[PDB]
Amino acid sequence: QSMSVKGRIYSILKQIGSGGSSKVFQVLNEKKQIYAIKYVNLEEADNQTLDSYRNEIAYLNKLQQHSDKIIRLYDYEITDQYIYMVMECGNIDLNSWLKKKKSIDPWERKSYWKNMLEAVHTIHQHGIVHSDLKPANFLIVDGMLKLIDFGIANQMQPDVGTVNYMPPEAIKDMSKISPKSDVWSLGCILYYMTYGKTPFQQIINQISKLHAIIDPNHEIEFPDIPEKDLQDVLKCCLKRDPKQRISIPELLAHPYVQIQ
Numbered sequence: 001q002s003m004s005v006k007g008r009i010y011s012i013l014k015q016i017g018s019g020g021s022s023k024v025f026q027v028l029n030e031k032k033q034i035y036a037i038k039y040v041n042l043e044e045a046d047n048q049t050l051d052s053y054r055n056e057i058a059y060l061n062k063l064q065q066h067s068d069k070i071i072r073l074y075d076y077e078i079t080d081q082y083i084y085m086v087m088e089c090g091n092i093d094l095n096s097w098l099k100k101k102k103s104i105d106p107w108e109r110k111s112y113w114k115n116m117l118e119a120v121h122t123i124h125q126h127g128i129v130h131s132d133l134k135p136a137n138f139l140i141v142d143g144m145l146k147l148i149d150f151g152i153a154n155q156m157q158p159d160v161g162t163v164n165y166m167p168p169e170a171i172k173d174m175s176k177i178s179p180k181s182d183v184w185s186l187g188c189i190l191y192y193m194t195y196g197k198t199p200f201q202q203i204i205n206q207i208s209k210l211h212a213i214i215d216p217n218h219e220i221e222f223p224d225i226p227e228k229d230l231q232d233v234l235k236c237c238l239k240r241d242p243k244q245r246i247s248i249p250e251l252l253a254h255p256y257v258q259i260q
Protein backbone atom coordinates (compact mmCIF):
# COMPACT_ATOMS: atom_id res chain seq x y z
CA GLN A 1 0.00 0.00 0.00
CA SER A 2 1.70 3.14 -1.33
CA MET A 3 0.88 6.69 -2.46
CA SER A 4 2.01 9.31 -4.92
CA VAL A 5 2.54 12.90 -4.11
CA LYS A 6 3.60 15.25 -6.88
CA GLY A 7 4.76 12.21 -8.85
CA ARG A 8 7.06 10.73 -6.21
CA ILE A 9 5.97 7.42 -4.77
CA TYR A 10 6.05 6.47 -1.11
CA SER A 11 5.16 3.27 0.60
CA ILE A 12 3.39 3.36 3.91
CA LEU A 13 5.27 1.76 6.80
CA LYS A 14 2.57 2.50 9.32
CA GLN A 15 0.22 5.00 10.77
CA ILE A 16 1.19 7.29 13.58
CA GLY A 17 -1.62 9.76 14.04
CA SER A 18 -5.15 10.74 13.26
CA GLY A 19 -8.00 13.08 14.00
CA GLY A 20 -11.13 14.22 12.25
CA SER A 21 -10.76 13.23 8.61
CA SER A 22 -6.96 12.97 8.60
CA LYS A 23 -4.15 10.48 9.13
CA VAL A 24 -0.43 10.68 9.52
CA PHE A 25 1.73 7.91 8.13
CA GLN A 26 5.37 7.01 8.44
CA VAL A 27 6.41 6.21 4.88
CA LEU A 28 9.50 5.62 2.77
CA ASN A 29 10.48 7.03 -0.56
CA GLU A 30 12.19 5.02 -3.31
CA LYS A 31 15.60 5.37 -1.60
CA LYS A 32 14.05 4.08 1.59
CA GLN A 33 14.42 7.50 3.18
CA ILE A 34 11.80 8.03 5.82
CA TYR A 35 9.14 10.83 5.92
CA ALA A 36 5.80 11.48 7.59
CA ILE A 37 2.93 12.07 5.22
CA LYS A 38 -0.20 13.74 6.47
CA TYR A 39 -3.34 12.86 4.55
CA VAL A 40 -6.47 14.99 4.78
CA ASN A 41 -9.69 13.75 3.29
CA LEU A 42 -11.63 16.73 2.04
CA GLU A 43 -14.90 14.86 1.34
CA GLU A 44 -16.84 16.59 4.11
CA ALA A 45 -14.81 19.72 4.87
CA ASP A 46 -16.85 22.90 5.25
CA ASN A 47 -15.41 26.02 3.58
CA GLN A 48 -14.20 27.25 6.98
CA THR A 49 -12.51 23.91 7.74
CA LEU A 50 -10.99 23.98 4.26
CA ASP A 51 -9.68 27.44 4.68
CA SER A 52 -8.10 26.59 8.02
CA TYR A 53 -6.03 23.85 6.26
CA ARG A 54 -5.01 26.17 3.44
CA ASN A 55 -3.94 28.79 5.91
CA GLU A 56 -2.11 26.36 8.17
CA ILE A 57 -0.23 25.14 5.03
CA ALA A 58 0.61 28.63 3.80
CA TYR A 59 2.20 29.60 7.12
CA LEU A 60 3.98 26.30 7.70
CA ASN A 61 5.43 26.56 4.24
CA LYS A 62 6.44 30.17 4.83
CA LEU A 63 7.84 29.77 8.35
CA GLN A 64 10.24 27.03 7.52
CA GLN A 65 12.89 29.51 6.47
CA HIS A 66 12.52 31.43 9.68
CA SER A 67 13.42 28.62 12.18
CA ASP A 68 14.95 25.16 12.16
CA LYS A 69 12.74 24.44 15.24
CA ILE A 70 9.77 24.20 13.04
CA ILE A 71 8.97 20.99 11.24
CA ARG A 72 10.21 20.59 7.66
CA LEU A 73 7.56 20.51 5.00
CA TYR A 74 9.00 19.05 1.81
CA ASP A 75 6.08 19.11 -0.51
CA TYR A 76 2.35 18.94 -0.60
CA GLU A 77 -0.43 18.20 -2.97
CA ILE A 78 -3.84 19.70 -2.68
CA THR A 79 -6.92 18.76 -4.67
CA ASP A 80 -10.63 19.13 -3.90
CA GLN A 81 -10.62 15.57 -2.62
CA TYR A 82 -7.48 15.57 -0.55
CA ILE A 83 -4.34 16.96 0.84
CA TYR A 84 -0.99 15.34 1.17
CA MET A 85 1.74 16.94 3.20
CA VAL A 86 5.23 15.40 2.99
CA MET A 87 7.14 16.25 6.13
CA GLU A 88 10.12 15.29 8.16
CA CYS A 89 9.43 12.23 10.31
CA GLY A 90 11.66 12.57 13.33
CA ASN A 91 11.94 9.99 16.03
CA ILE A 92 8.84 10.54 18.12
CA ASP A 93 6.44 13.09 19.56
CA LEU A 94 7.19 14.59 22.88
CA ASN A 95 4.05 13.24 24.60
CA SER A 96 5.00 9.65 23.89
CA TRP A 97 8.57 10.28 24.90
CA LEU A 98 7.52 11.70 28.23
CA LYS A 99 5.18 8.86 29.18
CA LYS A 100 7.92 6.27 28.39
CA LYS A 101 10.25 8.21 30.71
CA LYS A 102 10.73 8.36 34.48
CA SER A 103 12.91 11.44 34.83
CA ILE A 104 14.84 13.76 32.52
CA ASP A 105 18.50 14.77 32.46
CA PRO A 106 18.10 18.49 33.42
CA TRP A 107 20.52 19.57 30.66
CA GLU A 108 18.29 17.85 28.11
CA ARG A 109 15.19 19.43 29.72
CA LYS A 110 16.71 22.95 29.39
CA SER A 111 17.76 22.14 25.83
CA TYR A 112 14.17 21.08 24.99
CA TRP A 113 12.78 24.28 26.60
CA LYS A 114 15.09 26.49 24.55
CA ASN A 115 13.80 24.84 21.40
CA MET A 116 10.22 25.13 22.37
CA LEU A 117 10.73 28.89 23.14
CA GLU A 118 12.42 29.49 19.84
CA ALA A 119 9.72 27.82 17.80
CA VAL A 120 6.84 29.62 19.44
CA HIS A 121 8.67 32.96 19.49
CA THR A 122 8.83 32.46 15.71
CA ILE A 123 5.22 31.77 15.12
CA HIS A 124 4.41 34.88 17.38
CA GLN A 125 6.62 37.15 15.25
CA HIS A 126 4.25 36.42 12.40
CA GLY A 127 1.14 37.09 14.44
CA ILE A 128 0.26 33.45 15.10
CA VAL A 129 -0.88 32.38 18.61
CA HIS A 130 -1.13 28.62 18.85
CA SER A 131 -3.47 28.71 21.87
CA ASP A 132 -3.59 24.89 22.26
CA LEU A 133 -0.03 23.77 23.00
CA LYS A 134 0.58 20.25 24.37
CA PRO A 135 3.49 17.90 24.20
CA ALA A 136 1.88 16.27 21.17
CA ASN A 137 2.57 19.47 19.23
CA PHE A 138 6.29 18.86 19.48
CA LEU A 139 8.46 16.34 17.70
CA ILE A 140 11.84 14.95 18.77
CA VAL A 141 14.29 14.93 15.85
CA ASP A 142 18.04 14.26 16.46
CA GLY A 143 17.74 15.45 20.07
CA MET A 144 15.95 18.68 19.08
CA LEU A 145 12.33 19.58 19.60
CA LYS A 146 10.51 20.97 16.60
CA LEU A 147 7.03 22.48 16.46
CA ILE A 148 4.75 20.37 14.31
CA ASP A 149 1.74 22.60 13.87
CA PHE A 150 0.43 26.13 14.42
CA GLY A 151 -3.00 25.62 16.01
CA ILE A 152 -4.76 26.82 12.91
CA ALA A 153 -6.05 23.61 11.46
CA ASN A 154 -7.74 21.13 13.82
CA GLN A 155 -5.61 19.02 16.13
CA MET A 156 -4.12 15.54 15.64
CA GLN A 157 -3.58 12.76 18.23
CA PRO A 158 -0.49 10.53 17.99
CA ASP A 159 -1.23 6.74 17.97
CA VAL A 160 -10.05 11.80 24.11
CA GLY A 161 -7.99 15.05 24.08
CA THR A 162 -6.49 16.88 27.10
CA VAL A 163 -7.43 19.89 29.24
CA ASN A 164 -4.38 20.27 31.51
CA TYR A 165 -2.34 22.71 29.46
CA MET A 166 -5.29 24.94 28.85
CA PRO A 167 -4.74 28.57 29.92
CA PRO A 168 -6.99 30.45 32.37
CA GLU A 169 -8.14 33.20 30.03
CA ALA A 170 -9.37 30.69 27.47
CA ILE A 171 -11.90 29.48 30.09
CA LYS A 172 -13.10 32.96 31.15
CA ASP A 173 -13.52 33.87 27.50
CA MET A 174 -16.94 32.24 27.97
CA SER A 175 -10.98 38.97 22.16
CA LYS A 176 -8.88 38.00 25.16
CA ILE A 177 -6.35 35.42 23.73
CA SER A 178 -2.83 36.76 23.32
CA PRO A 179 0.71 35.48 23.11
CA LYS A 180 0.71 35.11 26.88
CA SER A 181 -1.75 32.26 26.48
CA ASP A 182 1.10 30.19 24.89
CA VAL A 183 3.44 30.94 27.75
CA TRP A 184 0.88 29.32 30.24
CA SER A 185 0.94 26.11 28.21
CA LEU A 186 4.67 26.06 27.62
CA GLY A 187 4.76 26.59 31.37
CA CYS A 188 2.62 23.48 31.98
CA ILE A 189 4.87 21.44 29.62
CA LEU A 190 8.01 22.46 31.52
CA TYR A 191 6.27 21.91 34.86
CA TYR A 192 5.59 18.41 33.75
CA MET A 193 9.20 17.84 32.51
CA THR A 194 10.36 18.99 35.94
CA TYR A 195 7.98 17.56 38.48
CA GLY A 196 6.98 14.46 36.46
CA LYS A 197 3.30 15.70 36.43
CA THR A 198 1.24 18.47 34.86
CA PRO A 199 0.12 21.03 37.43
CA PHE A 200 -3.40 19.60 37.95
CA GLN A 201 -2.84 16.04 36.72
CA GLN A 202 -3.80 14.50 40.10
CA ILE A 203 -7.23 16.09 40.03
CA ILE A 204 -8.88 13.68 37.51
CA ASN A 205 -12.39 15.17 37.76
CA GLN A 206 -12.82 17.53 34.79
CA ILE A 207 -15.21 20.26 35.97
CA SER A 208 -13.16 20.56 39.09
CA LYS A 209 -9.93 20.62 37.03
CA LEU A 210 -11.14 23.71 35.09
CA HIS A 211 -12.20 25.14 38.39
CA ALA A 212 -8.71 24.84 39.83
CA ILE A 213 -7.10 26.39 36.74
CA ILE A 214 -9.05 29.61 37.03
CA ASP A 215 -9.24 29.77 40.80
CA PRO A 216 -6.90 32.54 42.03
CA ASN A 217 -6.83 31.02 45.51
CA HIS A 218 -6.14 27.54 44.36
CA GLU A 219 -2.32 27.62 44.39
CA ILE A 220 0.30 25.54 42.67
CA GLU A 221 2.73 23.16 44.20
CA PHE A 222 6.31 24.07 43.39
CA PRO A 223 8.29 21.32 45.12
CA ASP A 224 11.66 22.80 45.89
CA ILE A 225 14.42 21.66 43.53
CA PRO A 226 18.11 22.27 42.89
CA GLU A 227 17.55 24.54 39.85
CA LYS A 228 16.11 27.67 41.49
CA ASP A 229 16.14 29.37 38.06
CA LEU A 230 13.97 26.56 36.69
CA GLN A 231 11.82 27.02 39.77
CA ASP A 232 11.38 30.69 38.89
CA VAL A 233 10.59 30.11 35.21
CA LEU A 234 7.65 27.90 36.22
CA LYS A 235 6.31 30.47 38.68
CA CYS A 236 6.52 33.23 36.11
CA CYS A 237 4.90 31.27 33.26
CA LEU A 238 2.03 30.10 35.48
CA LYS A 239 0.67 33.48 36.58
CA ARG A 240 -3.11 33.25 36.23
CA ASP A 241 -3.09 36.93 35.21
CA PRO A 242 -1.63 37.38 31.70
CA LYS A 243 -0.53 41.00 32.02
CA GLN A 244 1.58 39.76 34.97
CA ARG A 245 2.70 36.64 33.14
CA ILE A 246 6.27 36.64 31.71
CA SER A 247 6.65 37.09 27.97
CA ILE A 248 8.52 34.90 25.50
CA PRO A 249 11.09 37.61 24.79
CA GLU A 250 11.71 37.91 28.55
CA LEU A 251 11.76 34.14 28.91
CA LEU A 252 14.51 34.05 26.35
CA ALA A 253 16.67 36.29 28.57
CA HIS A 254 15.88 34.43 31.73
CA PRO A 255 18.88 33.00 33.62
CA TYR A 256 17.37 29.53 33.28
CA VAL A 257 18.19 29.66 29.54
CA GLN A 258 21.11 32.01 29.54
CA ILE A 259 23.36 31.13 32.43
CA GLN A 260 26.13 28.48 32.60
Ligand SMILES: CC(C)(C)Nc1nc(Nc2ccc(C(N)=O)cc2)cc(N)c1C#N
Nearest residue numbers: 016017036087088089091092093096156158
Ligand atom coordinates in the same frame (compact mmCIF):
# COMPACT_ATOMS: atom_id res chain seq x y z
C1 LIG B 1 2.59 13.67 16.12
C2 LIG B 1 1.67 13.35 14.97
C3 LIG B 1 0.30 14.00 15.16
C4 LIG B 1 1.54 11.85 14.75
N1 LIG B 1 2.07 13.97 13.71
C5 LIG B 1 3.35 13.85 13.22
N2 LIG B 1 4.26 13.02 13.71
C6 LIG B 1 5.51 12.94 13.19
N3 LIG B 1 6.50 12.09 13.66
C7 LIG B 1 6.22 11.05 14.58
C8 LIG B 1 7.06 9.95 14.50
C9 LIG B 1 6.88 8.87 15.34
C10 LIG B 1 5.88 8.90 16.29
C11 LIG B 1 5.72 7.74 17.23
N4 LIG B 1 5.07 7.98 18.46
O1 LIG B 1 6.14 6.63 16.95
C12 LIG B 1 5.06 10.02 16.40
C13 LIG B 1 5.24 11.09 15.56
C14 LIG B 1 5.93 13.75 12.15
C15 LIG B 1 5.07 14.66 11.57
N5 LIG B 1 5.53 15.51 10.46
C16 LIG B 1 3.71 14.77 12.11
C17 LIG B 1 2.88 15.56 11.56
N6 LIG B 1 2.14 16.25 10.99
